[PDB]
Design a protein around this ligand. Sequence first.
Ligand code: TYD
Ligand code: TYD
Lengths: 356, 356
Amino acid sequence: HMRILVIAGCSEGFVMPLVPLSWALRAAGHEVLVAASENMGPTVTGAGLPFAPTCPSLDMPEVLSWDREGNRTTMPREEKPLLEHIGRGYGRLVLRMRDEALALAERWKPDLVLTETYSLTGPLVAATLGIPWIEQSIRLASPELIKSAGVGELAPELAELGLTDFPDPLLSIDVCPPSMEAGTTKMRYVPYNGRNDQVPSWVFEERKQPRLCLTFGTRVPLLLQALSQELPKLGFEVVVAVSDKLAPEGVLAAGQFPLSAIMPACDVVVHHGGHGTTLTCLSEGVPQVSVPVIAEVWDSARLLHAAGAGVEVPSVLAACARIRDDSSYVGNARRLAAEMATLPTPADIVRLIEQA
Amino acid sequence: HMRILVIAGCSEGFVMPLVPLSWALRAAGHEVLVAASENMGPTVTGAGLPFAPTCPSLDMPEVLSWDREGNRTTMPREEKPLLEHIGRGYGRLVLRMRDEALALAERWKPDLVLTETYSLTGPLVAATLGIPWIEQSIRLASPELIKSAGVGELAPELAELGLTDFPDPLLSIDVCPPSMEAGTTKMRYVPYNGRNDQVPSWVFEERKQPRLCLTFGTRVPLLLQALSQELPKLGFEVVVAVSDKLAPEGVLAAGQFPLSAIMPACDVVVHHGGHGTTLTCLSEGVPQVSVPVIAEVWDSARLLHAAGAGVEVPSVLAACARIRDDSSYVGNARRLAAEMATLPTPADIVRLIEQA
Ligand SMILES: Cc1cn([C@H]2C[C@H](O)[C@@H](COP(=O)(O)OP(=O)(O)O)O2)c(=O)[nH]c1=O
Ligand SMILES: Cc1cn([C@H]2C[C@H](O)[C@@H](COP(=O)(O)OP(=O)(O)O)O2)c(=O)[nH]c1=O
């Protein structure tokens, strides 16, 4: 019987993929508490998990566009220092969370910390209290250059603990299918995509024409209205998964739909290359048209395109018809979904955590 | 990899205790879908689970106060036929759910049905499709007289399938601690008590006086305001767990608080003998003052009072001071909580289900 403090990010993409393992721990009789930014409250509790805020409402651009000195930062065009730039963003994110995250850790007294790769507040809190921690990957590929830059940015905070680098996690979890990737344990990606009123009625009824899902995530929407009007002309019934506030002919519906709920009713997905969106579409064996927006998802879209599970489009109307006609995309997507199903479940991983 | 259709009731007390096992299944990589009345949507999805309505908004009194003939029914004062009366209520509840629950089962095609003891729509749907089903108990004691009456009321519906009684479930789950009770597998009761914005701040900070939790559930509130004003005079800081719409001196707070989140910050609980409330307080080793309102929870309050884990009050101010001064109540409550922790987890049960 353990008390596990789960430390998450400031947007849905950094919180949702930690939900299945958190519930897997709770299912094993353990006490779980998810600590994240105050704006991630409804997301955490909407997943049925206990929540505690570590900082006010916060989004990544606030932290990424300003450094410790207080000076505005800009993004390098060169991919490599762009990744280091992003990494330092995650590092400074820790400076906003650590205080309340530590004080919460002092009082709640956890035995173990669960967190994602770029949420470095986890390792910091774990190292501060002198307790082990678990690292779970939430990406097809996690560029270590991002992580290293974040650790380097936190150097004054580690020296405060008389450290150079965070102590290695008790378990490093990876979710990339072996037939894709270029001290880690593999885990099957069980997708959690948020909270809806109910599973849409059209999901259960029969489908008499190819259905396409169009989604850009929770950050990229703020092109979507253009692809919505044109894609049906390619011979598709389209559904747009987007925020209800953000939410038409040939379109079936437009609104907040957890992908895992609607994926069985779809044949192809056009998206922004989002980590959670990609892995979810992968796990359900659906060919994807990935339009990689954010730099940190670039590697994942490369692994995806290479395996032929989908088409990376750095035109997207052309990529769909290319999938609508060629069947090798569906085949690979299903092959990889089948491969992920063989991997250990979050339930299997809980035992490993308990056992060592 | 299975598709499990979870069939629940029409009020929170019949839905919430099915959440942990449902997530335990989802954690093991299985596909889960919770089917309940339309008013139980927010409860299901608030737990992070997929939802599908089997009937419009519905509460137990509608079904219990009217029979198949369409005639108004009254409650017997004699406990025994009162239990049979209640049982026939659950039986007629099936008549309201079975249609949409069946059609949903035809299209979604589940391999297995998960349900509670008195949700007979589960067994009916399972028997109709010819698939196994799982019975989980959500009570300290489940009077078989209730269940038998429900089955008897459904006799025309079983004869429709050429049956007399529902086929025995693949697994019958019980949650009563061995040192309490008078083809079942024991499972530890992992409490899920709903959805809140966050864990209250006072839960983590230190407590310099005995704190009491006052809650009557989701049905009984519609006395609570009286016990709220008087109980602090007994030397207590009181917190009232009740609907926010329903929600003062000596009172710390009043509103919707999932018990499992606030239980560590409490010393004693006064309640309506609610099944979920009792089991949750039990699992956290907290002495209870049970005021049994509903007839079906009477047996549970008897098992509770006998074990000395609390005081059954069929005056409640006296029962608290009796617990506030005598320490044998806390001892038994903790002994039973310790006993439940030894029992197999919902995660352990998932394996059993997978294995046989
Ligand atoms: C807007 C929206 C998001 N989602 C989910 C899918 C993913 O799990 C998550 C999006 O995360 P992600 O795919 O990483 O993209 P991003 O981080 O840029 O937002 O939210 C839906 O399921 N339906 C929707 O309508
Ligand atoms: C109103 C309320 C209910 N609950 C929970 C506790 C139980 O899990 C459930 C109540 O179910 P239960 O104890 O069976 O009582 P009833 O069926 O009469 O409603 O709801 C809270 O945790 N906090 C609250 O403020």
